[PDB]
Amino acid sequence: SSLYGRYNCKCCWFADTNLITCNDHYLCLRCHQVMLRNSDLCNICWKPLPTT
Amino acid sequence: MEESVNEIKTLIRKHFPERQELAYQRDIFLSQHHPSSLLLEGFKLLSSLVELESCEAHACQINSDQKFVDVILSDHGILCPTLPKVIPDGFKLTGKTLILLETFVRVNPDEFERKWKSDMSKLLNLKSDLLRVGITLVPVVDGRSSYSNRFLADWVVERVRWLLIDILKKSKFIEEQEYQRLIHSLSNTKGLENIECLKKNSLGYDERLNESLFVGVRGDIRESVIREELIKLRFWFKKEIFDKQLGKFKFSQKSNLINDLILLGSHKDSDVPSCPFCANKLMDVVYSIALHPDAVERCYLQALSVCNKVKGLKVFNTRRNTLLFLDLVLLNLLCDLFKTYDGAIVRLRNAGIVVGQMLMLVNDRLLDILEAIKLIRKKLMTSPKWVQMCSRTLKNSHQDLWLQLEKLIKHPDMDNLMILAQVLVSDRPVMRYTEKICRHQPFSSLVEGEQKKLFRILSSISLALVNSMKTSFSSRLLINGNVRLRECYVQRFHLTKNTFGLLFYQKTGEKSRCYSIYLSTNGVLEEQGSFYCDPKRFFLPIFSEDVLIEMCEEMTSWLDFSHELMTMTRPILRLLVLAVLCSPSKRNQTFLQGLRYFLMAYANQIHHVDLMSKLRVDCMSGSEVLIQRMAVELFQIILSEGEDADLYFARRFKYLLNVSYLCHLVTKETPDRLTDQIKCFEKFVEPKVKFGCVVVNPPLNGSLTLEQEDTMIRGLDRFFSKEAKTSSDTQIPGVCKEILSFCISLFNRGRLKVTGELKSNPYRVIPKLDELGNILSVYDKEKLVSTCVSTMAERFKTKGRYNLDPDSMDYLILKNLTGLVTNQEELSVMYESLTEDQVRAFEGIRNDVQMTLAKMANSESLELLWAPFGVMREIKAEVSMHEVKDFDPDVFRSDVYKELCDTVYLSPYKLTYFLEAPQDICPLGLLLKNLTTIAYQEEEFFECFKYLLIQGHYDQKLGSFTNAALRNLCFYSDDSPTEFTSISSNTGNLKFGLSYKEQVGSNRELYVGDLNTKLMTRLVEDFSEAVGSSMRYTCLNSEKEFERAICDMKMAVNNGDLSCSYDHSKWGPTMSPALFLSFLHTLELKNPRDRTKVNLEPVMNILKWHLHKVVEVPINVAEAYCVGKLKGEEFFHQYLQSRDQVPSHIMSVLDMGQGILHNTSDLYGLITEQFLCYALDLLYDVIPVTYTSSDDQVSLIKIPCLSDEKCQDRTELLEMVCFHEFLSSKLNKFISPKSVIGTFVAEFKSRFFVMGEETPLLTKFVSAALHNVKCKTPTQLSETIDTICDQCIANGVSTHIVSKISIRVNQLIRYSGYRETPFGAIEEQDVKDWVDGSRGYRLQRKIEAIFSDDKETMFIRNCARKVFNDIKRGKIFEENLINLISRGGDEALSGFLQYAGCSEDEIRQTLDYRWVNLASFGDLRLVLRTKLMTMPTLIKTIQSRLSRAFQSSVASGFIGFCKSMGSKCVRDGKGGFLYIKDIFTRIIPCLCGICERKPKVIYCQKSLQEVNQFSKPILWDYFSLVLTNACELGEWVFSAVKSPQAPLVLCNKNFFWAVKPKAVRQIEDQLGMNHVLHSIRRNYPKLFEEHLAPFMNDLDSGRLKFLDVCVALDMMNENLGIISHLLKVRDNNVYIVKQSDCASAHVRQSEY
Ligand SMILES: [Mg+2]
Ligand SMILES: [Zn+2]
Ligand SMILES: [Zn+2]
């Protein structure tokens, strides 16, 4: 579709279930808490992670 | 007065009869008055004039009464039997050796060569049967382009060449059948289309040719028939092909893929051991060395330099007495230093000179003690003097200073030499030709230093491997399944403070050999191994031991998200990149490039069913099993991990894709030439034999027999007979006429997405074809032998008495081969530029020329004694291959005669068959006795046996109404088209020839054409390029819609459309010109202005010729098949079964030449693809769009609705895509198994777009930068590596890999004469100089980085700012500078500093920093490795701009470049070239202040007096660079440089974004022609400096602002190059960089 990008999350490509949104992109619920306790409140860059 | 006596009968009183006789043809020209005789006896007179000039130019007698070769040999007494009965123009016959010549004049470049080949092969057939008389024939043919004789000249344009055709065309009504031959011959014109003026006769073959092409193709069908047919076809397909699981595509699963991969490459069932080192013979040698297992030398290397300088100049008689004299010198020097010094052999001379019982020698060779002296006692006891008899030749025939001492003396002291031979007792090498003790530690346990050290040792070994071809290709040994190594070569490489390393071998040349690395640390030798390797495959890892480690570390750094994934994949990748380099093969390329198809099939959803049958390449040679295990085991550790497996899949995707692109580490070129020249003939003929439409040897002048017509018609009938409802799927080539007619019918009326709009009206040396890629052809060899015999057969006719033929004949040969640019120095630099195979070509020419000149002399069948003696084991049992087999005794074999069959035959008692003494300038009539004696004394025995068998007379086979077919003229142009059938053009049948092209997967074939068939192809390709250029969706020869396809495909992957990546298979051999005829026959293509039908009939008549074309069987495969099986391949089956003499010509319906009809098939694959878009839009809900590119396509199909769960109907896309594949089989387009369909990944021309951005290909661009070093000059390869490192930093590599490729190419120049230039190659230590910069800004940063204080280069930027502000703004303006630029530079720099206002205390202070040039008085004369027979700076490229095959290797290029940098290369004014060693040894060494900022690149003035003519400043070049870039980029270049504050910010390595090149704001606004008119108004008017291709007053305006100051700088300074830049657009402008390469880059403001 046209808003947003498809429905998959950018982290793992293969995931279209009850995921959550994020700044310009979606995130799955596994990848959210993984990337939350991986590094910080972000990536190494700033794509991800709005607060809960 | 009939206007025939006007200026014919009376102007013929005015000519010059200045040669052979008085009136001979003119007396029988005055007599006639009747014009039928007056013309026929007129052009015969003019042709007699042309042949009479052309014979005395070659100095032969005229063939007087048109007599044949049989009666012309039986004139003198040489009685010859029957013969092919040819008429020559002239003949010489100086006694058993005859020159035969023919002359002709053809104006056109097309019909020049088709007469030259014709009369050459009419003469060269005559040579093969002059054995019965034993005469050596030499043929010569001269064709010219005019009648420019010596007799009457040169207002011939008003003579008979113009008006005899006027007399013909006027008085045509007398009987003559008038021709376009006589107009086209006698006139002079200098070619495009509208071929319709030819006659078009037709035959009974052409009507059945048209009954098989244009029958069912109609294309006027209405649409609602076609829609019903397509719905019925879909019903049949879903019933009886799909739903029975007979489709070709299927879904993918994320477990069965990797569980069939590890049963594909991972060989479980092989006995190859598990560690990588034991599997490869070269990779444990690298492992064994990777653990550690000056006052005398200066007195030896200088003497060895003098020694091989003596070896360079020819001094003595034979090429063994040179080696014996030189080792006598070295052996006396060995005895000398043993007693003088104290630090003898035991302490200090074991630093490389002696290795234990063996010592160094002349051309990087070794020879042992006690066999050197046993060899030198051989002839010094037989020949009494041999020293004073031989040192006199060095006493008064060299330069006679000797550069030597009491070393070269008489009979050496053998007494202390035995003390030498008993101190040096024994350690002698093995070099073994020709298991389970795993003493190799596991690679994952080695500390990081030893892994990097395993890279270093491979660098050093590979450098010695490439240097092993530097040895001379004509030098041999003295003495000459493991062995024991008496003498050998050596290529020693250095490791540490005392350790060494040697590399023994035993042959010379450029192919694979037996090598044996030792390791001699402190004089103690040590075994390390032995291996075979092909040395020219090892060019990549030469100085690159930090490119590859930083590459592997970058790929590891992509996997940053988790440790114990990058501490686990780090040694697997290092060993992968190490084992790929340690064994290159085509099998490793063909494996590793096939894993991107696997990775896309794992990424997308749908894939072909024969995918896993194409990924498997079968194995050889043991190590390939381990490289396949490491490939397929690196995959299942990136993907397929535990619970957090596919966490960041984009990083894993680009990681495994760049692992798959490590097939570019292995070399792109061929492993062997004859196996690929076979493998590209059983890839040419295997589709045609299976299809069954092969005729062999057509009659080739046009017409055909009956059964060849019938085979052609049967192939046509099988082609157009596929049935629209059967199951002959993608295996069999053809086309059904129903679906093709549907495609044409919907194209004619406008319903497809491309119509017949048709803007822009669509009408708008002598190589032979059998032998492609060879070094020397047959025709070229007899050209060259004819050249040298006819040249040096009259040199000592007018200058001597046939008594003077020195080694200047080799100078004739070498200047004919290598051209030019004297007498044993440039003869040496010409002979040291021939590759080994063309060295053998040279030797085969020169012994032939010497044989002919030995036969040239005159001033028997009664005494033939014994050429071999008739008491040995043979008389003529196996040397009967001299009168039946192997026609001439020059190619008599010695293979089964191994090493001593021949030398037993070489013992007579030195009779008349040998000569008593070796000569040097031996007269003719006794050459072959000199040659057999100089081959006897040589210890080169089989050559001497062949010279005896030439001497013993063993070459014989025991000899002991008119104007109709008078093509007997010099200008009657029979090879010109007048009529044409459907197969012919009155000339021939459009010949072609085969070669290969050396890609990285598999070698694609390549067809070349004759000169007459290279313009017809050009007509058709230009027509279809025009017609396709009117269209909208093709992508082959455009760029606008290629960027538009990229911009659509990024969006289609980022939104979620089904993005299927297709690839068609066998596009070359399966297409056919019959398909393009039947397609184009019923198109419309309406004109732009008036909309009238284009007459497509000329392209029909050319495509019929393309249909009936002929090719040539290559002669190297036609000999390698008749050698084979001696009275197992699909081509070999159709080579043995033919009951003709031999097959040589192949004609068939198929094959559509590879690249020959390329744009036409782009049209076909465009229109039929749009038709399949229509069918899939009709039969489904989708809306497709394609981007075909003549071989492959991409199709971005979107699905309207149902993006929700519980689909049950949407997941059955399989019948759609299998039906697309079914119809594509129906048209002709077969889809290959490498074609993967789905979302998440799209690929088109290898671009690989992805959800996030795109995937950068690190490995492709780095491995393209590394082995693409082709070398002409250092500044040429310097800007070449600048453009490669430019286009590879556009694509996301880091700056560290770029800087290490820069360091590699700097150190790769410096392995030759060049010391260091301040311009260098390219910028080491760079950051931001690539986005807002060019070549000028990188050289500017390099020169500013030399002066690393920013106090001296400033005061040059301020001067540039003053002159630049005073050309544009205020109160001073400069308009008089061209006289200041051209006066040299030093005073010019002081003049441009005078404009700013400077003191004399500082205008000479900045004039002091200076650099040594080597291209000051011109350019370096270096002769490079190129093919046999292949003023200022910017003027040549502007002359190239105004005018709008066989391959070679890279390591041989670097060896030829390093050999042509130690010769007399540098130039010094008046000629008389010198060395680079001579110039750099005269520099005065001082610590003179200036030389302590960057030493031995920047010198002071007071240390360059002795060499002062090679000394320029850099502040002039720095001022020139700062001015000429600020012409064309920025005013910010005049500021300073400061740190960008470098804060503690987020240190991400993976936030690649894209940047636009900012601040490239020029001044000048669209140049291109406004400098050519500027290059006359302020330059001196050198518009007439070779005024080629004018735009003056036919094809000018000007006055652009800054070019007055900004072209003269390009004109005089050698290496700015700014007008090459500003006449071109940028190549990237899409730069993609990191986040910390823009927060850590130098900030140079405009005004700050
Ligand atoms: Mg493709
Ligand atoms: Zn996710
Ligand atoms: Zn081992």
Residue numbers in the entry:
A (entry chain B): 31 to 82
B (entry chain A): 1 to 173, 179 to 195, 200 to 302, 320 to 460, 466 to 511, 520 to 803, 820 to 876, 884 to 921, ...
Sentences from the paper on this structure:
Junin virus (JUNV) causes Argentine hemorrhagic fever, a debilitating human disease of high mortality rates and a great risk to public health worldwide. The L protein plays crucial roles in the processes of replication and transcription during the life cycle of the virus. Here we report the 3.54 Å cryo-EM structure of the JUNV L protein complexed with regulator Z protein.
However, we found that the C-terminal region (~400 amino acids, spanning residues 1818–2210) is missing in the electron density map, and a few gaps within the connecting loops can not be modeled due to ambiguity in the regions. For Z protein, only the middle region (AA 31–82) was identified and modeled in the observable density map, while N-terminal (AA 1–30) and C-terminal (AA 83–94) regions were not modeled due to the flexible nature and missing density. The Z protein, as an appendage of L protein, bound with the core-lobe domain of the PA-like region as well as the palm domain of the RdRp region on the opposite side of the endonuclease. One zinc finger (C41, C42, C58, C61) involving four cysteines is observed. JUNV L active site contains eight conserved motifs (motifs A–H), including six conserved polymerase motifs (A-F) and two specific motifs (G and H) found in segmented negative-stranded RNA virus (sNSV) polymerases. For instance, residue D1187 of motif A binds one Mg2+ ion, while motif B contains a conserved H1295. Our analysis showed that upon complex formation, L and Z proteins buried a total surface area of 2,150 Å2. Residue W43 of Z participates in hydrophobic interaction and is flanked by F688 and F1377 from L protein on either side, where W43 formed strong aromatic stacking with F1377 of L protein. L-F688A&F1377A and L-Y687A&F1377A have no observed binding affinity with L. Therefore we speculated that residues Y687, F688, and F1377 were important in the L–Z interaction, possibly in a synergistic manner, as indicated by the double mutations. The Z protein at high concentration in the cytosol environment would bind to the 680 loop at the product exit and block the latter, locking L in an inactive state.
